[PDB]
Structures are given as C-alpha cells and as structure tokens.
Amino acid sequence: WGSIDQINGKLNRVIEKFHQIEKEFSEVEGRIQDLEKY
Amino acid sequence: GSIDQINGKLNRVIEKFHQIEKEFSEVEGRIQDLEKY
Amino acid sequence: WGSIDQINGKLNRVIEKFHQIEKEFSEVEGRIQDLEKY
C-alpha cells in the first residue's frame, strides 16, 4: 500500500489547497466588485 | 481499484487547476480594466 | 496514466504550475490593495 497512500496523501493536500484558493478568489472577486461599483 | 481511483483523483485535481487557471485570468483582466481606464 | 511514477510526475507538474499561479495572485492582490488605497 505505500505508493498508493503517498500519492493519495499528496492529491488530497493539493485538493485542500485548491479549495482554499477558491475561497480567496471569491473574497477577491468581492473586492473587485466594490471597486467596479463604487 | 487503486491505479484507477488514483487516476480519477489526479484528473479531478487537473480539472480544478484549469478552472483555477481560468478564474485567475479573469480576475487579472478585471484588474487591468480598472488600472487602465 | 499507467504508473505511480507517472501519476506523481504529472502531479508534480501541476504543483510547479500552481506554485507560479500563487505568486501571480499575490501580486494581483497587492494591485487591488493599491486601487482600494486609492
């Protein structure tokens, strides 16, 4: 099992990071919207 | 089955990344718009 | 992909790329700050 668990671990860490950036993106898009609007 | 799920999970990761790539390109273009007009 | 070596190789190439997108985003975030700052 080791190869499989090490690749799964890494893919999961990538996926968590992607989720985190999607959140940062939403907040940034909010800020853009405020600069476009006001 | 393992190489199979692995493949599956990488492909999920690769699709996410492309969307990320696309979202980033869209933000930066809005930023340009504001900076130049 | 056929092998763990090759999956990890491709994952690594994503991670390298993503590394670069993060730097670009941070620079963009600073640009928003500047625009907010006015």
Annotate chain A with DSSP letters as a single string: -HHHHHHHHHHHHHHHHHHHHHHHHHHHHHHHHHHHH-
Number of other residues whose CB lies within 10 A of the CB of residue B7: 15
Say if the Cβ atoms of C25 and B24 lie within 8 Å.
yes
Number of other residues whose CB lies within 10 A of the CB of residue B27: 20
Residue of A nearest to B12 (CA): A15
Q: Which residues does B31 contact at the CB level (< 8 Å), separation at least 6?
A: A32, C28, C31, C32, C35
Say if the Cβ atoms of B6 and C2 lie within 8 Å.
no
In angstroms, how far is CA C28 from the centroid of its own chain? 13
C-alpha distances out from residue C33 to A10, B18, C12, Å = 33, 26, 32
Angle subtended at Cα B19 by Cα B17 and Cα B21, rounded to the nearest 5 degrees: 70
Q: Helices (H), strands (E): how many in chain A?
A: 1, 0
**CA–CA distance, B37 with C10 (Å, rounded to integer):** 40
Q: Which positions in chain B touch A23 (Cβ < 8 Å)?
A: none
Say if the Cβ atoms of B35 and C32 lie within 8 Å.
no
The structure tokens 């690749």 sit at A7
